[PDB]
Amino acid sequence: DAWEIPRESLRLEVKLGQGCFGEVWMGTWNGTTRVAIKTLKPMSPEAFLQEAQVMKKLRHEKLVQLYAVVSEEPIYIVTEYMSKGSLLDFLKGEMGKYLRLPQLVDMAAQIASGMAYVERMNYVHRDLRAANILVGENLVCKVADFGFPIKWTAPEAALYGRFTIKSDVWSFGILLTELTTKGRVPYPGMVNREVLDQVERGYRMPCPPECPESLHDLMCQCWRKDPEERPTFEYLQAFLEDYFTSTEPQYQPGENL
Ligand SMILES: Nc1ncnc2c1c(-c1cnc3[nH]ccc3c1)nn2C1CCCC1
């Protein structure tokens, strides 16, 4: 591939994360370029490289960009560096307190835009969640982790393994509650089985405090029982972009949103 780089052109400076497959470092590439670096802790090599095999085919400003690879053990996947790390940490940290609806709606729209690309390219994420969204300067968000947590997963997908772009739309509705509670785990107080039993019976999370009903109505569309009645990402993107003129032209900031 043209993606391949020499091992000595990489310097891993700061560990950012660790996990059951390996780790993520902040580093440099060709002594000039800030980069995120992912390692395979010697998962199968074929298994771990599938992510970059995908990120080679998908280019878009709201998807984290692959830069380079090292395809022999030890493996290295090199992408653009996102300075604020996961959206989940972002919302839960010192910035969460300063975010209001216009910022969060904007981030949602950026994500929707990324997912609209995925929709058009005919892929399926299957783990779309705030913990898998990355954030950079000036509130840029990007879809990441193209490598199942029940609370984020559509019923048909969790029960019958029917994973589609429509089950990603379902996750997006959950991710909207994460944006509007600023990182809270969805379905507060409920364990997995209780979530699954309840969602099947037609339970849906209620409108989060200070969140406008019009936004909770959007979540509710993403959580329709019939996958094909859920809106497209193109639709969601357009709605979120237009939100403050078309839907809440008289919105006022509150204490939290
Ligand atoms: N690109 C990044 N920039 C800044 N921080 C990043 C990341 C990633 C990250 C996310 N997805 C990835 N896929 C391949 C490498 C890779 C690295 N992960 N992380 C942190 C690791 C804990 C969550 C955020």
From Swiss-Prot:
Which residues carry the post-translational modification S-nitrosocysteine, per the record?
C222
Superkingdom of the source species: Eukaryota
Q: Which residues constitute the catalytic centre? A: D127 (proton acceptor)
Phosphotyrosine is carried by which residues? Answer: Y160, Y251
Enumerate the residues binding ATP.
L16, G17, Q18, G19, C20, F21, G22, E23, V24, K38
Q: Which residues form the Protein kinase domain?
A: 10-244
Q: How is it modified after translation?
A: Dephosphorylated at Tyr-251 by PTPRJ. Phosphorylated on Tyr-251 by c-Src kinase (CSK). The phosphorylated form is termed pp60c-src.
- Substitution effect: C222A: Significant reduction in S-nitrosylation
- Annotated compartments: Cell membrane; Mitochondrion inner membrane; Endosome membrane; Nucleus
Q: In which tissues is it expressed?
A: Expressed to high levels, and with a high degree of kinase activity, in certain fully differentiated cells such as neurons, platelets and macrophages. Isoform 1 is widely expressed. Isoform 2 is expressed only in the muscle.
Q: What does this protein do?
A: Non-receptor protein tyrosine kinase which is activated following engagement of many different classes of cellular receptors including immune response receptors, integrins and other adhesion receptors, receptor protein tyrosine kinases, G protein-coupled receptors as well as cytokine receptors. Participates in signaling pathways that control a diverse spectrum of biological activities including gene transcription, immune response, cell adhesion, cell cycle progression, apoptosis, migration, and transformation.
By sequence similarity, the record places it as follows: Belongs to the protein kinase superfamily. Tyr protein kinase family. SRC subfamily.
What does the subunit section of this Swiss-Prot or TrEMBL entry state? Forms a complex with polyoma virus middle T antigen. Interacts with AFAP-110. Interacts with GJA1 and PXN.
What name does this protein carry? Proto-oncogene tyrosine-protein kinase Src
> Which gene carries the instructions for this protein?
SRC
Q: Which residues of the full protein are shown?
A: 258 to 533 of 533
